[PDB]
Structure formats: C-alpha cells, structure tokens
Subunit: 389 residues, 4 copies
C-alpha cells in the first residue's frame, strides 16, 4: 500500500538514481519537483518556546537548500552526514581547525593539492601543530610515521598533480589500529570512482568546485563524516567559522550532481583515448593515467577504482621547461589554459611554472583535465601543441 | 601562428565540442571561462553619434548573455540565427504573429502540442486566420491540403503526446514547391536526434524548457531561422512583444546545453529498455516508442532520427480508464507524476486529465518522459504500478 | 486572541507596510522570512484526482514566487488581482491581444511611450484594429472620439517623455458612461504618487522595469485588474502567449519594491531641486516638472498626485539639436547616457535623436530620470554639460 | 575635455553618490550600467608569460564582481582596501587567525556579539591565545587592561545586544600609543552613522548580512583595512581559508548598498519614535536607544554618531521573564519574531533564548531591529503585545 510520491519501503535506490534524487523530495507545500532556493538569512519562529521547531533559525548555521545538498552528498558518499562549505579549502581548513591543537601531529601526503600544503605550512603551523609530509604510496610509511601526538592522517587519492594513488583500505586499517582519524581528499576521484568511506576512512573532504559542479560555475566544499560524533563537531565549527555554502551555490550543485555519472563516464572515455595517443607520441616523455599499462600502481588502480579511471591525466614533454612552455602557449581551442579541473571544458595547466622535482612535478610536467568535447578535437589540439614543443 | 585561445584555422569543430563551446569564448575583459551574467536593464552609450557602438542599448531588445546562447543555438541547429524567448509558447506565438495575417490559412499537425493547438483555435483565429488540423503522417495529405491562402505549414515531430512522426524532408520539398513557409517544432527530438533546418525547414521552434534545459530548472523558447530575412522579422517582433528570454535563464541554458548529447544518449538508452519491458508486459495494451520494432512509422524513424530514438514514449494500460488511473496513482519514486518532459527526473503524465479519441489520445493513455536514473529502478517502479493497476 | 505571526484581524496595514510585506508571509514549512525562489518548471501532483491541489502545475501558467509578487502588486495598486510579465511591453501587448478584435477601435495618447505606439501601428493594425492617437490633456477629446467600435481607451500619465497629465478620474467617468475599458499606464507615476484604479480605471499597466525595480536590474511588467472577469481574461491569455515573469525576476522585484516609497521620495526631492536649478539657467529654454510653478497642468497635478511630483523631468536647451547633442555628449558622471528611467542611477536621454514636433518632442528636448545620488553632484554635472551647449 | 562617462576632475563625489556609484563604472565591453555577475570558477590565461594579466586566475582568490564590491566598501568606509567574506563571522575569524598567535593577549568588549565571544572562548583559546572580556564603556579600562602580550583590542559599537558604546577615537589613541592593533566591529552603526577608520581604528569588520544588505537576502562579511600591509595579510589568508564571498552575493550587496543612506534614515526615524513610545509606556521597565534623552552614554553618542542614532533599540518589560515571553509571543505582524537585524522588515529578538545578567542581558530583555514599515503599524503592534504581557 504505497502511492505516487513514495519510495517503495525496504528498497534502496541504485547508484545513478541517488545522483538524480538523493536528499531531495518534491516541495511539500507546492509539489515543486526541485527544492526552492532559500535565498534568505533568517527564519521566523512560532513562539519563544517553539524555537527551532521547523528546524531553522539563521542561514549561517544551516539553510534548507544547503541541507538538501548535504543529504544528497552524504548518500552518494556513504556517510552519516555531510556539511557543505564556501570552498574545498574551507572544508579542509575546518578539518584542521576542529581536530588539531598545539602539540598535535598531522601526516599529510607530500604530493598534496598545493593549497592544502600552504595552509598547513604557512598557517596552522604557527599554532605549534606539526605537519609531516610523507609518501603515501606505501602504507607502511604511514604506519611508521604515526606518533603518540598524531591526530589526523590526511590522504588524497589520486594525488594532485602526479596522480599517485594511496591504498585507502590499508591506511584505514593502520589508522583504526592506532586510533587516529583518517581523512581522505577524494576530489580527483569522485564518489563514482572511489568512496573512501566505503574503504574505512573516517572523513572525506571534497572540493565540489571540481567534478560535483563540473561546469566551472561555482566554488564549494563538503566534509562527509562517518559518524554522528565527527559530524556534529564539523557542524558546530562551521557555524563558528562562518564558512557555510550559500543557498544559491547549493542549488547549482544539486542540479549539476544529477549528471556526474554520465559526465565522468564521458570524460574518462576521452581521457583513456588521449592517454593512449600521448603514450605513442615521440615528443612525450611519460604519460600518467591509471587506465594505461605503464601506470605504476596498476594493481591498486584495479582494486580501488570503480567504473572508470577518471578524467585526470598528466604527461611530461621532452625538452624540459622551455618545451613545456612552448607547448602550453600553443594549445588551441577547445582547450583552455587555466587552473582548476573536473569541468565539461577541457583544461590544461603546467603546475610548476604557474625543489619541486622530488614531489614528482618534473620540468616539462603537464596536468590535463579532460572534459566532454569531441575527443578528436582534443587530440588534434594536443598534437598541434606538441608540434611546437 | 595559432596560439592558446585560437581555434585551428580551417577545422570545423565536431558536434559535442560545439555543445560545450558553441557561441562562447572566454570573457575578453577578464578571461572568465563562462560569459558573465548581464543582469542589467540598460547600457550606457558613449555619445549620441556612437549610439549602439558596443552593440547593446536595452535588454528587452537584446542582451549579451542571451545573444551568446542564441549564437550557440543557431550553431547547434544549423541556422542563420536564433532568437530566445521567455517560453516555448512565446516562440510559437511570435511565429504566428509575424507570418500570419487575416485571411491566411495555416496547416497544423492535428497531433500538435495542446498549447499550440489552443493558441491557434482560441486566440489567433479571432483574427480571421484559418488553422486547419490535418494528419501529417503522410506528406501527400499536406500537399493535398495546401490552399491558395496557405502561408505556413507547421509540423511537429515526434508529436506531443502520441509520438507520430512527420517526414520533414518530404514536407519541406512540398513547401518549397508551393512557396509556403515550413515551421517545425522539434522539441521532442532535440537537435542531437533531428535538425529540421538540415532537412529543408524554413524555421525551427524549440521549447528549451524541455531538453535544452533538461533539469526542470527554467522556462525558455527559441526560434531558429534559415535566413537573415526571416531572422530579422522574428527579432523585430520579439522586441515589440516584449517576450525575450532573460539573462539568468540564458546562463542556465548555456550551462545545461553542454551535456545535452550525453543526457539524451542516457535517456534514450533507458527509454529503449523501458519500451521493450512495456511491450512484453501482460497488463500493457499498446506501447509507442520510435525505437522498438513494432513502431508504425519505423521506416521514417530510421531515416530521420540520427543517434537515438529519444526519451519520450507512451503506452496504454489494459482495462481502460480506471486501470490507467490506478496505475498512475501507484507509480512510486523515482518517478514523478506531473506535466513537462525532457528532464533528468523521469516523469509520468496523463494527457487527458492534465474528442481526444480521434487522433490517438485514448482512455488509459500515458505519456512517459524518461530521465537518467538507473533503468532498473524505473522498471521496478512501473512494474509495481502495473501490478496494482 | 492573536499571536506572533498573525496580522491583527480587522486592521488594514498602512501604505509603507504594504510595500514591505504585502502579498508575502514567512514560508510555512521553514519560517523563512522571505519566500523562496521556485526556480522550477513543473509541480508534482498527489494523484490524478487531486490535480491542482496545492495550486500549481507548470510555471508558464503560474509560479509561487511570481504569485507572491502579484499579490503584493495588487494590494499596492488597489486591484482585484495582478498578472506579472517578462516586460512592460508584454503586459501592454497582452491587453491589446485580449481586448481588441478586427474592426475594433482603440484610443491611445499621442504622446505614448514609443514602444506602445510602434506595437499598435506596426503590428496590431494588421489585424484591422483601428488605433487613433489623440491629445488626452482634455477629457472631452476622449469623449468625442469614442465610437461604437471603441473597446479600449489607453491613457498614460505622466506621459513619456513630455510629462503631460491625463485627468484619470474624468476619463474614467467618460469610459464608464460609454462602457469602454479604461486602461492606464502609470509607470512614470508609481502607485506611491497615483493609483489609477482608485480613480476609476478598469486596468493598470506597469513596466516594473522602471521604478518597481528601481535598480536597472530586471525587466518586468504587470497588469492590475479592477475585477475578477478582467483578471481571469488576462491570466488565461498570459498562459497562451507564454510571456509570464520568471521566478527569479519576481524575487528581485519583491525585494526592490520594499524601498519604492523611500526611493521615490528621494528621487522626487532631487528632481524638484534640479527642476528649480534648470528653470533659472540661461541656456535652458523650458523646464517641465509637475512641482514647479511653470508646469501647465498644475491644477490637475495638485489634484491627482499624492506625496511627491515624481522623479522624471524634461527640459529644452536653447539652440536646437546641435546644442542638445553637445550637451548630451558632455554630461559627466554620476549621470548615465542611456535609455530607461526610474533607477537609483540618474539617467539622461534625448528622445528624438536616439514630424515629432507636434507630439511636443522639440529639437533640444531632454528627458531626465533623477536617481538618489547627492543632488549637488547631479546639478554640478548638468551645469558643466550646459556650459558646452 | 571631460566627456560623457568621465567624472569631473578634481571633484570628490559626495557621500550618497558614492553609495550609488562607488567602485563601479559601466562595463567596458558592453556599456552595461551594472557590472555583470562573474558566476565563474576559473579564468583563462593568454600565455605562461602573461599569467594574471587581466588580473584574475581563480575565484577563491579574487573574482571581478567581488572586487567591485570591495572597492565600493573601501571607499564608503574610508579604507585602503577591503576583503569580502562568506559571512561576518568569517571576516571576524580571519582577523583572529591573521593577527593572533599562541601566547598573545586580546581585549574584547564583554558585550561583544555572542558569536564573536564564542569563536574566541570555545575555539581560538585552544591555541593558547588569551581573550580578556572587559567593559569598553570607559576607555581608561582599556588602557589599564593592556598587557605586554596584548596584540589586538577588539571593540564593537554599538554593542550587540545592549547597545553600549565604545569611544572609538579615544581607544584608537590608546592603541596607537601602546602599539596595539585596534579592530572595530561597527555592524550596528553602518558607515553612514560611524566610520571607525576615520576615528583611528586600524581595521573595521562588518557583517554585511545586516544593514549593507538590509533585505534579509544574503550572508556576507567585510574587512576594511587602514593600510596596504594589513590589507595584504587579510587577502592572503582569505585565499588560504577559502572563505571569500561569492559573485552572486557580491552582486546583491552592490545593489542593496545603493539605498543604505535612505534606508538607515527611515529605520532610524522609526526607531526614534518607537523608543520615545516605549519610554512612556507604563508596562516598559527600561528603554535603550542612543537617541532618546535618557541614554546613559548620550554624550558619546552625540560625539560619535553622524546623522542618525541607528535602527537598533532594546527594552525590558515589567514583570520579569514571564511577561517578556508573553509579550514576544503576542507581537503581531508586521513584526517578525526571529534572529538577525538591520533589515527592511522589523524584527523582535529575545537574546537569552535565541551569567547573561552581569553585562546587561536581563530577564525580560528584548532586542528590537526597526525596519521601514509605517511606524504607526509598528507601534500599534508593540502596544497590542504590551497590553497582553
Ligand atoms: C581544488 C582542490 C582543492 C581546493 O578546493 P577549492 O574549491 O579550490 O577551495 C582541494 N583538494 C583538491 C584535490 C583539489 O583539487
Ligand atoms: C512544452 C512545449 C511547448 C511549449 O513550450 P513552453 O516552454 O512550455 O511554453 C511547445 N511544443 C512542445 C512540443 C512542447 O512540448
Ligand atoms: C518602458 C515603458 C514601457 C515598456 O516597458 P518595458 O519593461 O521596457 O517593456 C511601457 N510604458 C512606459 C511608460 C514605459 O516607460
Ligand atoms: C551578525 C553579526 C556578526 C556576524 O555576522 P554573520 O554575518 O552573522 O556571520 C558579527 N558582529 C555583529 C555585531 C553582528 O551583528
Ligand atoms: C587550486 C588553485 C589555487 C586549483 N584548484 C588548481 O589545482 O588548479
Ligand atoms: C505543457 C503544459 C501546458 C507541458 N509542457 C506538457 O506537455 O506537459
Ligand atoms: C524604451 C526603449 C525601447 C525605454 N524604456 C525608454 O523609454 O528609454
Ligand atoms: C547572530 C546569530 C547567530 C544573529 N545575527 C543575531 O544576533 O540575531
């Protein structure tokens, strides 16, 4: 006995259905199929006694549109709850703010996203928090570097920009044994390819700017928590730091998330073909893509990646820095020369120009974000650029 | 000589590249990869003499964000130019307002979208314009029905809600011989499946509300004209009728159009499987889908549809009206019971309750718009509803 | 016995309170003090039987945000109901579309807004509708020009750009005697200065673009009807023409309307001072402003205008067209040289350059929209411009 | 030589002109009178060498719409530069993050906004930063409380919710002598009433949520710095913390700031009349408003407030807590029972329920934010509620 507008009780929607509908139901007041945008700072209360009945009071603390996105994101990533932020850096910084105090130690991948690196070094370390950067490719490095003061192990997989993988299940096992928080930044992967919470991570951080948005439209971040205790700590501190996502951003991301599976499938199919083309090009010294046989962590890629190997790839042009620069300066449309990644629009950048040599970022190293354009235009443009290297 | 930011000279970008990038280059002032939203009524002029240098004066007439969308739409549909409107109905009535005058005769598909039918009968016919509704399935019917006062032949394909097809190329040949304007509403098809301007139509009308948007987010319309003379008449009259699209809607549509190929591929693959499922179901009386082998206009569908047979299908439940209604009252989530079509969210519609019998709209007749959810959830939901019917 | 969140029963809110709160109450579901933006095309129905319970089905026909604005506008203008449109021209054109048929006659002010003029002449007259342009300054001209075929008398007061007044109560008396519809465009006045429905008009048309918005942000129109029968006709035809306002525009206008009284008071105080300054300047041949003693319809202005004499003024520079042009070309910031009016930003334009001499628009004639800047900057800028005339 | 579009050289525009036009010129590309919304994540670079020519790379770092708002805010507040943030709390915590390090002492008003108090105690003090809450009413208290480790003196004026004043100029003289940073939160005052940078403060923090917005529409924060060195530290750290304002919020705030002078004039005139009414009411125990003659810091208010005494007031109901609660449960529309302040809509707040006794926040203590409704409706509503108390 269930009617139009109910899910059938006892059934779990399958993956692509969750991207379309998770966290959202038609508006109860009007039936609007999309939740309205609560572009609104404050919420009227029925009486002094009934404060917070209806659930809301002030949009810095929580907002209904933002909360619909958080419910969707928690379902997609497999978490107890999620908090959404103005940016991915805000999400990351809130984890550092909540879980570290002076005297604590934090292990971070040495090939982090650069911003994560700069916020650790140039900011939180003034609170006498010890950040140690290590090679997460071997989990025993993590196990050996954990101290009694270690509170957080912060992995990223694939890693910005070298696309190293971290074995998330094994690191989680180590972190569970040592009772330390395992935080994983899986922005490059997407939950469609890898869900760190499924593999035992305690927290996931996402830049929703990148693939969740996928359109170069909005900035955003999310923290997805494995437990209520962690979630409530993140939520409380978000209210204090004032870095919640806005209702309009959340509306845009509720919309673009619906297509994340078909976008990432297309981007990943394009990236596989581009990586194969570059691996045969004589001006190209090395290609990094988890889907080609030369990838050094192929075994882990096949264990840890679902569905696809992602839209990110990297390569090194022969001839070092001058050659990388000539190539960049001649990459034609439809490519865009710019920062960011994950978008329908294909993007290329040179991480070093825009030492570093021990992090993998060699002289002619190029990070490529593959979009959903026709792959022949993308390949023709790279081939032209490489003719100038 | 080609540098970053230039297209390779002498290359036509491929189709999916045009969906991503058509009509848009990075902002010249800032490099912004998306054009900014010109949420702005009026445009400052540098002098009386240099009036309309920079090209804009007032947003009812033209607006830069709307103009970017129009360039993209004209490129995708293969037209000389496009005009964007607040809604598909505004686009349609602007065509009727511009190209019909008292004493004129207009042939319309008798299976027209019901709105198009009702603006003709209940509104424009008070101006002594004669609208004749005829069966467009056989082009010879069109040729035979043309009269000395015929000015417009207004086809639609597939037709709302019965999915009858019209042979656009054959009708265009007839219209070209008799010197009559051919207008085609290809809302249900999408330029990814069928481009009437390639098949000889003089004008295309689109409800961008449906598939161009594809997210239940915005209303919009577009008129794509084969020639400059037609385009300039539409543009002039849009300014007079005050029914242009807004900048914010144009921005949303510029974003959602980038994924139209992958969305329509996913929706159409889902629709093919749903239509096969329904065609085998013992409580289903008839199934209409241009891609299943029993489709009555199979030969024209294979000639006229490019990649897919679309996301729309229709079927009738055995047991007549009471069974159709019981079925629709029990269709569970992920389905939505509502009007409209074309969206990521799958939609089930009852065309009678949201004579009718003469041209297909039967008792238990159900119009289905297939979204991008997991097809197995969609089928599970219909199978539940059918078992309750 | 009434509590927080109720109006006291039996009391009518006063004028400025209606601009702040009319048509809107906190969201029942969340208490949001502002209504959320229903950026949403379609609305899910509970069952086939309960179609249109909850009130909505499709945003071309009606949308909740748009309806909140319509309720506010109907209260502010004193009408039974209001319909909102994509633009003021759409509102006007819908009145012509609904109330005129071939053979009918329509009286229109000869100093109309130009667009109204061009849509009558260059478009509706092809339906054999006879538009006659007359001098509304004397009501007996209206009474003498009414024919048995006259269905609409269309007044505008103050008139674009000459600021002639029409005696709205007297014209209404004439129209009631002859049983013809009196439609008044009171865009230049605002309901804060004159409510034609209070003076017996049957319909008001507004470009909400101008003062209701007041920020050069959105386009919009409204039709406010004196009766249910008129309202329902406008509503039905809006659904057919597809020219409804969007939810986002309605949200912007729900916000900017809150300040219309304080904006228009400031603009009107500035305009009075500017008009006094120009009336003494030796390069200025004539100044038109209802608040200065030289205004020809001063008696009617004092009868018909409440609170203020408005933010619009006009003047003629000595030396004809070349002098008007030199002046325009040298009007400095904070002035903007552009079309439109009613905004926080002061705007100046020359109507003729951008015969006409019998409509009042003389050679050196300048239409001025006064904003809310400091009046000394505005006057200093005009004085500088006039030194170049 | 000055032409349309130029300011007169050597003239400082007056204050209300800067609210309308500060930081914004017509779009160079199109003449758009409002800057377009750069709803856009990343910015295309023309070459490796010309990196950050055009001035933008990524919206977390800087965005053109946000930068226009920052220029306007810096002009209005009288600063070298401004940084805009997602919220006022983000602005505040960015100040604490940049200018405090372990071992540092910080003096804060004991009547600080409660959020500011709770980010200090419950968060930054875990970094061995000592926050001391002292009575800022007498500047000598500040001078006496400074210690060798004092780095920041953080004043607020008027204070949330008690409306205590701090003598900003005297405190700035003390801070300049002791070489200590003076930060002033003048959210309640608005730059129209009081500019701390003019009174010697080193930094101003604003919740733009409140009066800059004034419409309950957006969240936002701003930090306005007296020097380049301070501004560059704030900017660098905003990029690291990921808490910048978004382009859409900056667009709303650019619009709402244009009317801040006339809004605050209207709200303050209403608040003066409400405060006089309350001061005469037999069920009112105490009334706090800086403009009524019994205000305890009347002399400083007359020295420090420019045009108005603001829209905030507070009062206590006779009969203690039960009476205050009965009163608030019966305050009718147009009042809203909720958090926040500064808006067109009048708001009544209970600060305890939305120790406290030591610094003013008594039993029946009610915080009132006066909007721009008709003052007689506002008073009628309070008089009804008071009669029920
Ligand atoms: C971009 C990014 C971030 C930072 O997110 P923003 O949204 O840019 O603040 C963090 N981690 C990774 C892997 C990232 O790519
Ligand atoms: C929906 C539709 C229309 C009308 O478009 P709106 O955007 O709803 O005004 C016209 N033709 C077809 C085939 C349609 O489906
Ligand atoms: C501007 C105007 C119009 C047209 O309104 P739009 O919003 O520009 O379509 C109609 N009447 C008057 C008096 C006007 O000023
Ligand atoms: C509201 C407020 C804040 C915090 O600003 P948010 O925008 O709510 O984060 C800081 N100071 C005062 C005085 C405030 O009123
Ligand atoms: C980070 C820029 C600060 C950006 N997302 C990138 O990786 O390019
Ligand atoms: C038309 C509603 C008036 C709608 N697009 C439909 O066909 O459902
Ligand atoms: C009309 C332009 C077509 C505009 N509102 C004006 O009067 O300037
Ligand atoms: C703060 C809520 C956390 C709010 N601006 C208030 O003081 O009401």
């Amino acid at each position: 006995g269930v009617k139009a507008g109910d899910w059938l009780p006892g059934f779990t929607p399958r993956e692509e259905t969750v991207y379309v509908h998770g966290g959202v139901e038609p508006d109860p007041l009007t039936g609007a199929i999309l939740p309205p945008i609560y572009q609104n700072t404050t919420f009227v209360q029925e009486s002094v006694e009934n404060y917070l009945s209806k659930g809301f009071s002030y949009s810095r603390t929580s907002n209904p549109t933002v909360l619909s996105l958080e419910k969707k994101i928690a379902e997609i990533e497999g978490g107890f709850g999620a908090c959404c932020f103005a940016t991915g850096m805000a999400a990351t910084v809130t984890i550092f703010s909540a879980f570290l105090a002076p005297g604590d130690h934090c292990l971070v991948t040495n090939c982090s996203y650069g911003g994560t690196n700069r916020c650790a070094r140039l900011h939180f370390s003034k609170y006498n928090i010890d950040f140690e950067f290590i090679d997460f490719r071997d989990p025993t490095n993590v196990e050996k570097a954990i101290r009694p003061q270690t509170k957080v192990v912060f992995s990223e997989s694939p890693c910005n920009p070298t696309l190293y993988l971290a074995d998330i299940e094994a690191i989680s096992q180590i972190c569970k044994e040592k009772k330390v928080l395992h935080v994983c930044d899986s922005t490059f992967a997407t939950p469609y390819m890898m869900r760190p919470l499924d593999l035992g991570a305690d927290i996931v951080v996402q830049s929703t700017t990148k693939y969740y948005d996928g359109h170069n439209c909005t900035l955003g971040g999310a923290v997805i928590s494995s437990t209520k205790e962690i979630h409530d700590k993140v939520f409380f501190l978000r209210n204090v730091m004032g870095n919640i996502m806005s209702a309009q951003t959340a509306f845009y991301t509720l919309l673009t998330l619906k297509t994340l599976p078909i976008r990432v499938e297309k981007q990943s199919a394009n990236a596989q073909k581009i990586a194969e083309f570059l691996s045969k090009h004589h001006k190209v010294e090395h290609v990094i893509y988890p889907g080609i046989p030369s990838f050094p962590q192929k075994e882990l890629a096949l264990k840890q990646h679902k569905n696809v190997h992602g839209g990110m790839l990297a390569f090194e042009v022969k001839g070092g820095t001058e050659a990388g620069i000539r190539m960049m300066n001649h990459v034609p449309r439809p490519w865009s020369l710019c920062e960011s990644l994950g978008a329908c629009e294909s993007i290329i950048t040179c991480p070093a120009v825009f030492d570093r040599l021990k992090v993998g970022i060699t002289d002619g190293f190029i990070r490529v974000s593959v979009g959903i354009e026709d792959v022949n235009d993308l390949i023709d443009g790279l081939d032209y650029a490489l003719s100038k290297a």
